Amino acid sequence: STQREYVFIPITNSITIDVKITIGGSDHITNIDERGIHNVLVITGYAVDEKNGRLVPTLDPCDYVKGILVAGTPQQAQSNDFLTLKLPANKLYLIRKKGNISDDLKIYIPYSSPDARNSMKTKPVSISDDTIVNNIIKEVFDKIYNITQKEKVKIEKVKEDIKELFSYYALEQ
């Protein structure tokens, strides 16, 4: 059918080495369509674990992480750490939704143990201080997408829309 993987966008660079396939298939729900990013997924209650970057699943609805989802397979020696699961594409909190759904898809999500060893003083953060948008164009929007520098010129578009769209919660301990 259709398998994808949801990768997060933090202020940290804990993304470059955990993945095997970037595209793989022939379609990507997340898009870059001459306006900005489309079909961004947000997950409630999960808080990033940037040191060994994964989403620690908390049950606080006020916490959230939003990222992109592109097809592939995450470095087969897995399924002991990640959360992989299929859904009918409609119970996804997909924001800036442009495209429709196949109402079935199996997506891998970076999971981490709940970490019952500290007090989870989660903390909200967003992307600013443009220095760290350089590397976010470097390692998520080039390593994965073939569109950058190939079809579209408006890249400061995907500068401000990425540092305006994306926000999340960290654990800071």
């Binding site: 947000v42 409630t44 606080d60 006020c62 959230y64 909190y93 800036r96």
Partner: protein
């Protein structure tokens, strides 16, 4: 007759309007209008009373009858109000808009013998005067108000503000016939005053609301409990509503700073219950506090004691429309940035906003949803999209694929509620947003949906998690 309580409040970006529809004018500045506080207190009191009456008796009373029941505290044409409001805005001494000079006599030149529309724009940090006759003269001027360079951006970014700014921006000057220079000067001068006063928007207006009580008006029948209910309504107003213009979209949002009772026997259950808001660590705590206050008045507090009086009057279902609070619909999210939140409210509430577009599809229900939850809108029967489709997504008969059916909204059989929903221009929005802060630097976005009386037992489940999704996308 005696000071009852004293509330140090704080409003964020109030859009208070005076006789010129602005918070400032050539004569005085007024950021908080006590008459608006009184009117909104009475409006929230009626909402809260129908809320109560519906959570116990399932009955809804007209606003006339509710205010006739409370006329012992709020007064009417037959009795003077027992409560006297006294706003004290600190720094509230003499301030007014003074246009020390404006350097026209160049705009007047390019205007004569013509009929042109003179538009303004205040971004670029210099006032330009666009003319639809294809010229854009930059205007030099000196005023008394210093638009902080944050207000220009707050108005240019917020699509709602820049929309209500169309009315304070232009004049269609006709100089074809006899047109001296002096009267054109005064025309453009008043246009510039009317445009510049709009930018008097301050952040964090802070005022003290004193409440005085006439004791001479005795405990006639049920004065003490009516008064306690009114004080609860005032707290609910301070918690869920704001002052001024477009409070349904976060502007003018109120926040408690300090409450002080002076008559324990009446208000010492409001003093602490408002102390319950000087420190809000997380969103869940706030939602819990709000559900606490909401439930307190619902069953635990006073009782049906004065609802047993036979002065109220149940509403007609098809000729009346009243609002009441629904405890379920009270999403809360942490803010981290107020200006951007206010700007994203437009993404929430606009038919082509990229948050409700990403939460609702088919667009028809979308229109329907907003038409049922976003106040009045200007839909007109020209290109089919209104024909049937939105009429269908509002039928109280006829299907259940839409979770909201207006009571008497009929298929081609519109009698009253059809015109009221589609034509009555002054309709408040049920979906509302508010922003709160405490003595700490914690800020939260409440999004709620007041329950109306034209909903034929709305599906409280579909719209409920529409609201969490909206509250997420706009923060």
């Amino acid at each position: 007759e005696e000071l009852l309580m004293s509330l140090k409040l704080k409003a964020l970006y109030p859009l208070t309007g005076g006789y010129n529809r602005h918070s400032i004018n050539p004569f005085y500045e007024e950021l908080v209008r006590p008459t608006e506080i009184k009117g909104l207190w009475r409006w929230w009191n009626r909402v809260l009373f129908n809320t109560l009456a519906y959570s116990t008796k399932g009955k809804l009373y007209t606003y006339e009858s509710i205010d006739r029941l409370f006329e012992d505290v709020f007064g009417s044409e037959n009795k003077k109000s027992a409560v006297r409001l006294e706003v004290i805005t600190d720094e509230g001494n003499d301030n007014r808009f003074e246009l020390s000079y404006v350097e026209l006599d160049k705009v007047i030149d390019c205007l004569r013998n013509y009929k042109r529309k003179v538009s303004l724009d205040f971004i670029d940090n210099t006032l330009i005067a666009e003319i639809e006759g294809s010229t854009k003269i930059p205007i030099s001027f000196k005023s008394n108000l210093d638009i902080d360079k944050i207000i220009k951006d707050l108005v240019h970014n917020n699509k709602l503000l820049s929309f209500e700014l169309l009315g304070f921006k232009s004049v269609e000057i006709d100089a074809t016939k006899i047109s001296d220079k002096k009267i054109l000067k005064e025309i453009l001068r008043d246009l510039i005053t009317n445009y510049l006063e709009y930018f008097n928007i301050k952040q964090e207006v802070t005022f003290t609301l004193n409440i005085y009580l006439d004791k001479s008006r005795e405990h006639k029948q049920n004065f003490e409990d009516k008064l306690k209910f009114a004080l609860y309504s005032l707290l609910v107003f301070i918690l869920l509503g704001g002052i001024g213009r477009k409070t349904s979209r976060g502007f003018g949002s109120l926040s408690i700073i300090d409450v002080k009772c002076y008559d324990n026997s009446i208000c010492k259950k409001i003093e602490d219950l408002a102390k319950n808001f000087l420190k809000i660590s997380s969103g869940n705590e706030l939602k819990s506090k709000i559900e606490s206050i909401l439930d307190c008045i619902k069953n635990s507090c006073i009782d049906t004691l004065y609802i047993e009086n036979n002065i109220l009057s149940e509403i007609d279902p098809k000729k009346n429309v009243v609002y009441f609070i629904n405890s379920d619909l009270f999403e809360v999210k942490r803010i981290n940035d107020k200006e951007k939140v206010l700007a994203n409210i437009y993404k929430a509430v606009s038919s082509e906003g990229c948050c409700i577009k990403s939460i609702i599809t088919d667009k028809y229900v979308r229109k329907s949803f907003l038409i049922a939850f976003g106040g009045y809108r200007k839909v007109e029967k020209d290109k089919g999209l209104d024909i049937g489709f939105i009429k269908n997504y509002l039928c109280e008969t006829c299907e259940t694929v839409s979770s909201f059916n207006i009571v008497d909204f009929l298929l081609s059989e519109g009698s009253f509620m059809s015109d009221y929903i589609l034509q009555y221009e002054h309709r408040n929005s049920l979906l509302r947003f508010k922003l709160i802060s405490d003595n700490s630097n914690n800020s939260y976005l409440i999004g709620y949906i007041l329950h109306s009386s034209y909903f034929k037992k709305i599906d409280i489940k579909y719209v409920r998690c529409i609201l969490e999704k909206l509250t997420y996308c706009v923060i």
